[PDB]
Amino acid sequence: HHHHHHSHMGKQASASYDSEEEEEGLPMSYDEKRQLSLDINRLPGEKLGRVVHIIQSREPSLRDSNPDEIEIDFETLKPTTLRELERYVKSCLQKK
């Protein structure tokens, strides 16, 4: 009497990518405004120069009024604007 055992535990893999590269501009939730704030607050003054510059390009009122003290208002800022802050800070934190 000899013995052999057999079994095939076949589990499916998963790989998914977005088809487009469009400005999704989804309704940015309250917490994602905070998520930018903490992660931008840890960026050096050099990066803070570009961080505000894109906001001042969106808000020409604050651009012209104050080139010295700049208040980034995330809550009213457009999800298309904050898209740049998100992808940029993420590119500073991660090698991406």
Partner: peptide, 23 residues
């Protein structure tokens, strides 16, 4: 280059003023 500012929280966690600081 410039006088080094700091990013500071303006009341709300959704507002940050980069105040005019000396390096």
């Amino acid at each position: 280059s410039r006088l080094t500012w700091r990013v500071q929280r303006s009341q709300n966690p959704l507002k940050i003023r980069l105040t005019r600081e000396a390096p």
